[PDB]
Design a protein around this motif. Sequence first.
Motif, PDB file in Angstrom:
ATOM      1  N   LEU A  27       0.806  -1.224   0.000  1.00  0.00           N
ATOM      2  CA  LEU A  27       0.000   0.000   0.000  1.00  0.00           C
ATOM      3  C   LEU A  27       0.842   1.278   0.000  1.00  0.00           C
ATOM      4  O   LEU A  27       0.491   2.252  -0.662  1.00  0.00           O
ATOM      5  CB  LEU A  27      -0.949   0.010   1.208  1.00  0.00           C
ATOM      6  N   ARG A  28       1.948   1.259   0.737  1.00  0.00           N
ATOM      7  CA  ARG A  28       2.833   2.419   0.859  1.00  0.00           C
ATOM      8  C   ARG A  28       3.459   2.849  -0.476  1.00  0.00           C
ATOM      9  O   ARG A  28       3.801   4.016  -0.650  1.00  0.00           O
ATOM     10  CB  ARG A  28       3.939   2.124   1.881  1.00  0.00           C
ATOM     11  N   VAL A  31       0.577   4.212  -4.846  1.00  0.00           N
ATOM     12  CA  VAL A  31       0.080   5.417  -5.517  1.00  0.00           C
ATOM     13  C   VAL A  31       0.758   5.609  -6.883  1.00  0.00           C
ATOM     14  O   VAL A  31       1.981   5.547  -6.987  1.00  0.00           O
ATOM     15  CB  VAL A  31       0.292   6.684  -4.653  1.00  0.00           C
ATOM     16  N   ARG A 157      -4.921   6.521  -6.241  1.00  0.00           N
ATOM     17  CA  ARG A 157      -4.636   7.736  -5.488  1.00  0.00           C
ATOM     18  C   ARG A 157      -4.730   7.391  -4.003  1.00  0.00           C
ATOM     19  O   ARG A 157      -5.083   6.269  -3.659  1.00  0.00           O
ATOM     20  CB  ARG A 157      -5.622   8.852  -5.851  1.00  0.00           C
ATOM     21  N   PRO A 158      -4.385   8.325  -3.121  1.00  0.00           N
ATOM     22  CA  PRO A 158      -4.467   8.088  -1.673  1.00  0.00           C
ATOM     23  C   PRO A 158      -5.804   7.535  -1.158  1.00  0.00           C
ATOM     24  O   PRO A 158      -5.778   6.652  -0.300  1.00  0.00           O
ATOM     25  CB  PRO A 158      -4.201   9.473  -1.094  1.00  0.00           C
ATOM     26  N   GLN A 159      -6.931   8.030  -1.677  1.00  0.00           N
ATOM     27  CA  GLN A 159      -8.254   7.558  -1.263  1.00  0.00           C
ATOM     28  C   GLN A 159      -8.534   6.123  -1.729  1.00  0.00           C
ATOM     29  O   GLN A 159      -9.217   5.363  -1.031  1.00  0.00           O
ATOM     30  CB  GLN A 159      -9.377   8.519  -1.715  1.00  0.00           C
ATOM     31  N   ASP A 160      -8.003   5.754  -2.894  1.00  0.00           N
ATOM     32  CA  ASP A 160      -8.106   4.380  -3.391  1.00  0.00           C
ATOM     33  C   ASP A 160      -7.308   3.419  -2.508  1.00  0.00           C
ATOM     34  O   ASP A 160      -7.757   2.310  -2.226  1.00  0.00           O
ATOM     35  CB  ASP A 160      -7.599   4.268  -4.837  1.00  0.00           C
ATOM     36  N   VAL A 161      -6.126   3.856  -2.073  1.00  0.00           N
ATOM     37  CA  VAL A 161      -5.237   3.026  -1.257  1.00  0.00           C
ATOM     38  C   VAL A 161      -5.846   2.812   0.133  1.00  0.00           C
ATOM     39  O   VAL A 161      -5.629   1.776   0.763  1.00  0.00           O
ATOM     40  CB  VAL A 161      -3.816   3.650  -1.158  1.00  0.00           C
ATOM     41  N   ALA A 162      -6.624   3.789   0.586  1.00  0.00           N
ATOM     42  CA  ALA A 162      -7.319   3.721   1.864  1.00  0.00           C
ATOM     43  C   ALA A 162      -8.460   2.711   1.809  1.00  0.00           C
ATOM     44  O   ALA A 162      -8.708   1.999   2.781  1.00  0.00           O
ATOM     45  CB  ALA A 162      -7.852   5.093   2.235  1.00  0.00           C
ATOM     46  N   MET A 163      -9.154   2.662   0.672  1.00  0.00           N
ATOM     47  CA  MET A 163     -10.229   1.696   0.449  1.00  0.00           C
ATOM     48  C   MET A 163      -9.658   0.291   0.415  1.00  0.00           C
ATOM     49  O   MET A 163     -10.321  -0.655   0.831  1.00  0.00           O
ATOM     50  CB  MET A 163     -10.963   1.983  -0.865  1.00  0.00           C
TER      51      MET A 163
ATOM     52  N   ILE B 209      -3.042   5.998   6.233  1.00  0.00           N
ATOM     53  CA  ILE B 209      -2.485   5.712   4.912  1.00  0.00           C
ATOM     54  C   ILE B 209      -2.976   6.714   3.859  1.00  0.00           C
ATOM     55  O   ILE B 209      -2.241   7.044   2.929  1.00  0.00           O
ATOM     56  CB  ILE B 209      -2.779   4.239   4.492  1.00  0.00           C
ATOM     57  N   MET B 210      -4.203   7.204   4.012  1.00  0.00           N
ATOM     58  CA  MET B 210      -4.733   8.208   3.095  1.00  0.00           C
ATOM     59  C   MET B 210      -3.984   9.523   3.243  1.00  0.00           C
ATOM     60  O   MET B 210      -3.747  10.211   2.256  1.00  0.00           O
ATOM     61  CB  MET B 210      -6.229   8.448   3.318  1.00  0.00           C
ATOM     62  N   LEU B 349     -16.166   5.988   2.338  1.00  0.00           N
ATOM     63  CA  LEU B 349     -14.939   6.176   1.571  1.00  0.00           C
ATOM     64  C   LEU B 349     -15.202   6.154   0.061  1.00  0.00           C
ATOM     65  O   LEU B 349     -14.461   6.763  -0.706  1.00  0.00           O
ATOM     66  CB  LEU B 349     -13.965   5.050   1.935  1.00  0.00           C
TER      67      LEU B 349
END
Lengths: 383, 379
Positions: A27-28, A31, A157-163, B209-210, B349
């Motif tokens: 995940l890190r 992006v 993007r960051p929001q996708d990685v959070a999901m 993480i976001m 989300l």
Amino acid sequence: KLVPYREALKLLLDDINEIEDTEKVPLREAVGRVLAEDIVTEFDIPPFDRAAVDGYAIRAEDTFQAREYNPIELTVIEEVPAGNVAKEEVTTGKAIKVLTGTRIPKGANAVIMQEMVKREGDKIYVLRPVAPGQNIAFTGEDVKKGEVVLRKGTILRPQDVAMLKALGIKKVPVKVKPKVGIIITGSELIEEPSEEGFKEGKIVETNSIMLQGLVEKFFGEPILYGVLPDDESIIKETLEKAKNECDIVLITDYAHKFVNLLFHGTTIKPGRPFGYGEKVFIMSGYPVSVFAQFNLFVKHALAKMVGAQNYEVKVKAILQDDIPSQLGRYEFIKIYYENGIARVIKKKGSGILSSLLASNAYLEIPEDSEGYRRGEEVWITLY
Amino acid sequence: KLVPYREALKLLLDDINEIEDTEKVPLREAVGRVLAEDIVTEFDIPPFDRAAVDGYAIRAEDTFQAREYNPIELTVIEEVPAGNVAKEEVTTGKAIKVLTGTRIPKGANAVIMQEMVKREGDKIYVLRPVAPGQNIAFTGEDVKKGEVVLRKGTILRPQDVAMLKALGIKKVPVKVKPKVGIIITGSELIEEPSEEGFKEGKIVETNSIMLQGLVEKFFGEPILYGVLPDDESIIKETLEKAKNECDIVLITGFVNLLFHGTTIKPGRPFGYGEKVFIMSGYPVSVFAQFNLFVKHALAKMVGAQNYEVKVKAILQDDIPSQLGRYEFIKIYYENGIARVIKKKGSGILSSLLASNAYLEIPEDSEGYRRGEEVWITLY
């Protein structure tokens, strides 16, 4: 005969296939990467029906005939403490005090806010009709189980990685970056600007580093084979590039001696002498011309190889200046876009890089157009 | 009651300062970094007069009488190979074949294209006059000596890095990345959905993480301080350590409070105080607070210019808004059309996934009717 841009782009892209290979990245480092497949959740979020407010879990049906002068009375049989579940069920004429987050008791299909009812002892009074599903965060309202949350080709993007973390995915499958070879050619070319270099008629090499960044911007891994002299034997190591890489880019006798070309000599301007064959892109050597060739050809090939979706933004803009245009030539026009206005940057003419710096975007004018006037709305592509 | 958004943004940014530390990074990793200072060229580019075309360096005045019915003969005395300079001088009646990029030989003042003349032996024939300077890329027509070619605060792109290479800069001075502490509070947080807590209502922690991806996208380096419990370890154990190790600190949900309770929606309980950003626990609220406050603060810290893009679109749906609240509404932009993302919930989300832009509605507005032309900011 110069082949039209749209015919050249089709011939080129039909030759290019989507790379099959994928890999799991953490995940890190996710992006900017391109999803290899659809991501399907195995969890409902939230996992159960929740009260969206501190209130009373009732039957919506019980309050349909509720008015200011006809208060429906309900009886409070339970008050669920924080983080608990209701022991009792909800039947007709009943209600169960809950907090936000609490699972909706069996029997209840709605929740009424605390403050919207009068609390007289063990009875509550509702003055208005409550809808079924009122103040309930239903199961999977965010994402439901077995639902696609991210499509294939998505650029994370960051929001996708959070999901992805919400679904419990530690390492997400993405396409392997296409390896793109870069061969520069020219005995004229030199790595550093110096006094003695200028007196021997040498110019500083610039397209290598620009293409490295551009390939990295658009999904690829650039691999340098360095600057080579004008020498047929040494340029025959293009064979090493084709083996090592998925596609290969080379900079500027003749070029059909090294490549079996689908086409060579195209309609675009600048970038007219562009050709392609056997995964090899013949480029122009002057920075402004290489940039137009990259955006009009290479960018779209790379996107096809990873199956990238939404890798460019088209914007509506009012044109500041007139752009006269040659018929038979597909114009790549550099634009600085700001405040809904496309300001045309005009320059030259020896691969003079500063027009690339001053520009924000580009406009494409087809061959059958003599040009646009100021005031006309145009569609442009952001860098 | 609530501090207006424009007033609260000004209070936050006035407290934020540009970091003065710089750093020299190689061109290979320069893209996305912010330029510490102006960069002036020490050379003219091009460095010398060269041909803009494959042809023949000549003297222009030999061709002044040239007509189609009066061809003028010049004698090719030399053919310069690629990369070399002419060993010979162009004088009256003479020509030297040159390729594009070749230094203009001494004595020549113009270059006629090869397509325009006819080659028979060691001679060319000019049927049309050519002016002095024709088809010559002169010295400094791109960039002159002492000119600023790249501005302070430029977010470097492939073409900018190209200019740096042309200038002989191997390592470019850029701002050091602002360090951004990230502290997550919340007693109901778990780390993954497979844990037993998930089915009881514990929420998977995704704001960390976001925010890491959000900070890295906008110029900063994120430093993790993890999910911290309800104890003394919150207030000035982790928070004091984070304020000393980082330039700013984000904390999702004491500080000497500059303000708290602002007018934005969502993200009303946003507050700021001595480099610390008290933010929401809901992903949508945290995302809106980042774009409306934290993004602009990171930009000011590195002096970044043109870090966001605003475009014109046409609303596909109506957008009812309430007075006294500065709306952050998510939209999906595509080919001049702004579709509003309508889904709202307890802490969702998916609506951030379905949007690629946002529209801002001021406090003094009742909304926008479908068909109106609004300005939106791309993610």
